[PDB]
């Protein structure tokens, strides 16, 4: 079982699933081997009804698609569609929040409100929306309207790109035609240009992909911005992670998917339904997180994280998960079938994301509290059904310090330098106590023993004094292995980094260091890392492609992760991916993505499946940037 997951709680549940005859994602993967080599290399096209077409990576025919599409066209078109799909997810999330904010301030959804007025005003200023003598509700209406306007063409480009990157970066991108005109406009143009008999030049196709990836960035940044307005900007919080956060004697409710519009309300209503739960024989409702919506409520409310990504089924296998409340994205549809075995009530809530066999309870923002109560009463009923049934919750959890929004990191640093908060961080980059910054992002992937790449790479980087930040299920991996517990600083961190984390933590009152890794939130909250890195660039007067900052999507899975990796490259970062994207069937495309793009954006992909080697390559990238700034390394 350690060949499947490096998480001991997951291993324990894999043994339980095995002896109970419950098929898991790992079993489904085994049943898929050997996987198709055409698909693995990207040398397959189904873009018209003359297909399917394939190209042998090596040897004899077929060498070309039926319409004449070359390997580099086919590979580039497939990649572009994955970027567009990712952009569609993050920006769909953002759109949902924009409509929620609009309804809130129009009096149509009283369960929602402006919680972070300071954030609202800062965003308005950034967008050029007047605030002086205006009512907050009117400012918010204008911010929501601006968010929606960025989905289509208008007299300005996408402001959630052009107003969040430094002017010099916008200039580089504009010179290459990479600034998106509208989010949904770019998604549609990708689908058009990649359809049969359209774009058939690899460089042209890939430039289109870079532009669409910036539409994805805009959607991420918009989603973080609007969620902070509505639900509060995260600040440091302490909680726990892993399956041991479930409680046999409570009604255990997982929030799973992505959007806090749903989960945030589940959290607050669950508190109000405590004596209902107790009337049912439970101690209360224990809300726990899975995937990014779990990260959202962890960051804002300290809701403990149950599990993440590939291991999500394992929460159900305990026998203790009374409900799994879903919105969209990254939910294995197997959960609907496993629920039949485990007793769990799986509940979908969004019209565009249903799962055959799950109960659907429409969630309307206009009726959010009532809908939440209906959902939570299903969960209480489920608890009652498992009275007297044995459960097997692994007694395995870690302590997690999280909540490191960009605002929170600046505020923490400000305790060392009140009027120049980024300077103490830069000072320690310059003196070598901080070698550079690495963002871990993205998924787990069944092909990689769960968490092995994240923890292997992070350990090497921490020992080398890298400041490590994380989001999504990368943060999930790290938190479940103790990388968010300050008690582990002495073991994990180099002496430089330890000194810095200790100095900040002591100056912020909590008699000890910051944690080894800073949790910056959900996958849309990769945008927070952009805000931090853009602020450093502006403070230093250099573009992002000069900074000693890298990213690693160490165990990537979703199309969303492909989009994020691509915008990380587009904004100027060396960006590791630890699984193979379907590009190796075309050397010219691989060379563009890993080498020639450096001449366009300054960023580049590092494709490396061996995590020790990946760590070495990431350190080399950081140190090259250090040398370019005239720094020792």
Ordered DSSP codes for 459-470: HHHHHTT-EEEE
67 binds ligand SF4 (CB under 6 A): yes
Supply the angle between the helices 260-272 and 71-105 in degrees, to the nearest 10: 40
Residues 256-295 that bind Fe ion (CB under 5 A): 292
Of the pair 81, 169, the CB lying nearest ligand FES is at 81
Of the pair 141, 549, the CB lying nearest its own copies is at 141
Write out the H or E segment, with its range, that includes residue 297. helix 291-301
**For ligand FES, what does the binding mask look like between residues 5 and 44, x meaning CB under 6 A?**
-------------------------------x-xx----x
Give how far Cα 466 sits from Cα of 124, 424, 485, 613, Å. 34, 15, 17, 16
Of the pair 126, 447, the CB lying nearest ligand SF4 is at 447
Ligand-binding site membership of 220 (annotated): no
Residue 192, burial from CB neighbour count under 10 angstroms (0-12, 13-18, 19+): exposed
Binding-site member from 1, 48, 156, 503 for ligand SF4 (CB under 6 A): 48
Ligand-binding site membership of 198 (annotated): no
Ligand-binding site membership of 212 (annotated): no
196 binds, among Fe ion, ligand SF4, ligand FES, none (CB under 5 to 8 A by kind): ligand SF4
499 binds ligand SF4 (CB under 6 A): no
Helices of type H across 571-610: 587-591, 598-601
220 binds Fe ion (CB under 5 A): no
Nearest-5° Cα angle at 398, 257 to 550 = 65
Of the pair 301, 558, the CB lying nearest Fe ion is at 558
Of the pair 484, 551, the CB lying nearest its own copies is at 551
Least separation, in Å, of the C-beta of 361 and ligand SF4? Answer: 25
65 binds, among Fe ion, ligand FES, ligand SF4, none (CB under 5 to 8 A by kind): ligand SF4
Of the pair 531, 553, the CB lying nearest its own copies is at 553
159 binds, among its own copies, ligand SF4, ligand FES, none (CB under 5 to 8 A by kind): none
**For ligand SF4, what does the binding mask look like between residues 17 and 46, x meaning CB under 6 A?**
----------------------------xx
How many whole angstroms separate alpha carbon 453 and alpha carbon 449?
Answer: 8
Question: Could you give the maximum distance between any two Cα atoms of the chain, in Å?
Answer: 72
Which phi and psi angles does 246 have, rounded to 5°?
A: -70, 150
81 binds, among Fe ion, ligand SF4, its own copies, none (CB under 5 to 8 A by kind): its own copies
Of the pair 78, 436, the CB lying nearest ligand FES is at 78
Q: 112 and 365 in contact (C-beta within 8 Å)?
A: yes
52 binds ligand FES (CB under 6 A): yes
Which phi and psi angles does 34 have, rounded to 5°?
A: -80, 140
523 binds Fe ion (CB under 5 A): yes
540 binds ligand SF4 (CB under 6 A): no
Give the chain's radius of gyration (CA, Å).
24
Which residues, 6 or more positions from 231, have their beta carbon under 8 angstroms from its beta carbon?
Answer: 115, 116, 260, 264, 296, 300
191 binds ligand SF4 (CB under 6 A): no
How many whole angstroms separate alpha carbon 624 and alpha carbon 343?
Answer: 54
62 binds ligand FES (CB under 6 A): no
Which residues, 6 or more positions from 81, have their beta carbon under 8 angstroms from its beta carbon?
Answer: 190, 191, 194
Ordered DSSP codes for 488-528: GHHHHS-HHHHHHHHHHHHHTSSSSPPPSEEEEESSTTHHH
Question: Taking contact as CB under 6 A, which single stretch among the options 67-75, 286-294, 348-356, 393-401 is the one that binds ligand SF4?
Answer: 67-75
Least separation, in Å, of the C-beta of 196 and ligand SF4? Answer: 4
Question: Taking contact as CB under 5 A, which single stretch among the options 127-135, 264-272, 515-523, 591-599 is the one that binds Fe ion?
Answer: 515-523
Q: 246 and 306 in contact (C-beta within 8 Å)?
A: yes
How many whole angstroms separate alpha carbon 439 and alpha carbon 422?
Answer: 18
How many whole angstroms separate alpha carbon 487 and alpha carbon 503?
Answer: 15
65 binds ligand SF4 (CB under 6 A): yes
Residues forming beta bridges with residue 126, ordered by sequence position = none
474 binds, among ligand SF4, Fe ion, its own copies, none (CB under 5 to 8 A by kind): none
Of the pair 77, 185, the CB lying nearest ligand FES is at 77
Binding-site member from 7, 13, 41, 54 for ligand FES (CB under 6 A): 54
CA atoms within 13 A on the CB side of 197: 4
Residue 428, burial from CB neighbour count under 10 angstroms (0-12, 13-18, 19+): buried
Ligand-binding site membership of 473 (annotated): yes
Least separation, in Å, of the C-beta of 594 and ligand FES? Answer: 23
Residues forming beta bridges with residue 240, ordered by sequence position = 399
Q: Which residues bind ligand FES (CB under 6 A)?
A: 36, 38-39, 44, 52, 54
* Residues lying near ligand SF4 in the complex (CB under 6 A): 45-48, 50-51, 53, 65-67, 69, 74, 196
Binding annotation for [Ni-4Fe-5S] cluster: 258, 292, 330, 443, 473, 523
Binding residue positions for [4Fe-4S] cluster? 36, 44-45, 48, 53, 67
Residues that constitute the known binding site:
36, 44-45, 48, 53, 67, 258, 292, 330, 443, 473, 523
Interface ranges with Fe ion (CB under 5 A): 292, 523
């Amino acid at each position: 079982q350690n060949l499947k997951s490096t998480d001991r709680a997951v291993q324990q549940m894999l043994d339980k699933a095995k002896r109970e005859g419950i098929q898991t994602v790992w079993d489904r993967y085994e049943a898929m081997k050997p996987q198709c080599g055409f698909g693995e290399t990207g040398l397959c096209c189904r873009h018209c009804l003359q297909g399917p077409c394939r190209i042998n990576p090596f040897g004899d025919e077929p060498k070309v698609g039926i319409c004449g599409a070359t390997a580099e066209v086919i590979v580039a078109r497939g990649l572009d569609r994955s970027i567009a799909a990712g952009a569609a997810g993050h920006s769909g999330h953002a759109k949902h929040l924009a409509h929620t904010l609009k309804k809130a301030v129009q009096g149509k959804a009283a369960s929602y409100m402006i919680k972070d007025r300071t954030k609202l005003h800062s965003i308005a200023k950034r967008l050029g929306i007047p605030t002086e003598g205006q009512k907050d509700e009117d400012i918010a209406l204008e911010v929501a309207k601006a968010a929606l306007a960025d989905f289509h063409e208008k007299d300005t480009p996408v402001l959630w790109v052009t107003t969040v990157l430094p002017p010099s970066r916008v200039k580089v991108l504009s010179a290459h035609g990479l600034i998106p005109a509208g989010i949904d406009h770019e998604i549609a143009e990708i689908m058009h240009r990649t359809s049969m008999g359209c774009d058939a030049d690899a460089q042209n196709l890939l430039l289109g992909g870079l532009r669409c990836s910036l539409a994805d960035l805009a959607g991420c940044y918009m989603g973080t911005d609007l969620a902070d307005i509505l639900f509060g900007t995260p600040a440091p919080v302490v909680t726990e992670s892993n399956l041991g956060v479930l409680k046999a004697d409570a009604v255990n409710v997982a929030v799973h998917g992505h959007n806090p519009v749903l989960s945030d309300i589940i959290v607050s209503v669950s508190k109000e339904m405590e004596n209902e739960a107790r009337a049912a024989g439970a101690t209360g409702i224990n809300v726990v997180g899975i995937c990014c919506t779990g990260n959202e409520v962890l960051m804002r409310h300290g809701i403990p994280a149950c599990t993440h990504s590939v291991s999500q089924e394992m929460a159900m296998i305990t026998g203790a998960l009374d409900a799994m409340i879903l919105d969209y994205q990254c939910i294995q549809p197997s959960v609907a079938t496993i629920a039949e075995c485990t007793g769990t009530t799986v509940i979908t809530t969004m019209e565009m994301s249903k799962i055959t066999g799950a109960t659907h309870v429409n969630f309307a923002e206009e009726a959010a509290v009532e809908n939440a109560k209906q959902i939570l009463r299903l969960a209480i009923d489920t608890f009652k059904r498992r009275k007297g049934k044995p459960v097997e919750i692994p007694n395995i959890k870690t302590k997690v310090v999280a909540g490191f929004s960009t605002e929170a990191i600046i505020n923490a640093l400000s305790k060392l330098n009140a009027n120049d908060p980024l300077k103490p961080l830069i000072d320690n980059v310059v003196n070598g106590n901080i070698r550079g910054v690495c963002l871990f992002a993205g998924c787990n992937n069944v092909k990689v023993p769960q968490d092995q790449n994240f923890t292997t790479i992070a350990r090497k980087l921490l020992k080398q004094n890298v400041l490590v930040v994380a989001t999504g299920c990368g943060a999930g991996a790290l938190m479940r292995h103790g990388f968010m517990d300050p008690a582990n600083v002495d073991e994990l961190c180099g002496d430089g980094l330890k000194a810095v984390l200790t100095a900040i933590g002591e100056a912020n009152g909590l008699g000890g260091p910051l944690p080894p890794v800073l949790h910056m939130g959900s996958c849309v909250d990769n945008s927070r890392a952009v805000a931090l890195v853009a602020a450093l660039a502006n403070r230093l007067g250099v573009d992002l492609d000069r900074l000693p900052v890298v990213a690693s999507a160490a165990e990537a899975m979703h199309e969303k992760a492909v989009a994020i990796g691509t915008w990380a490259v587009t904004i100027g970062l060396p960006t590791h991916i630890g699984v193979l994207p379907p590009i190796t069937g075309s050397l010219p495309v691989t060379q563009i993505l890993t080498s020639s793009v450096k001449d366009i954006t300054g960023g580049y992909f590092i494709v490396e499946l061996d995590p020790e080697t990946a760590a070495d390559k990431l350190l080399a990238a950081i140190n090259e940037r250090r040398a370019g700034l005239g720094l020792p390394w």
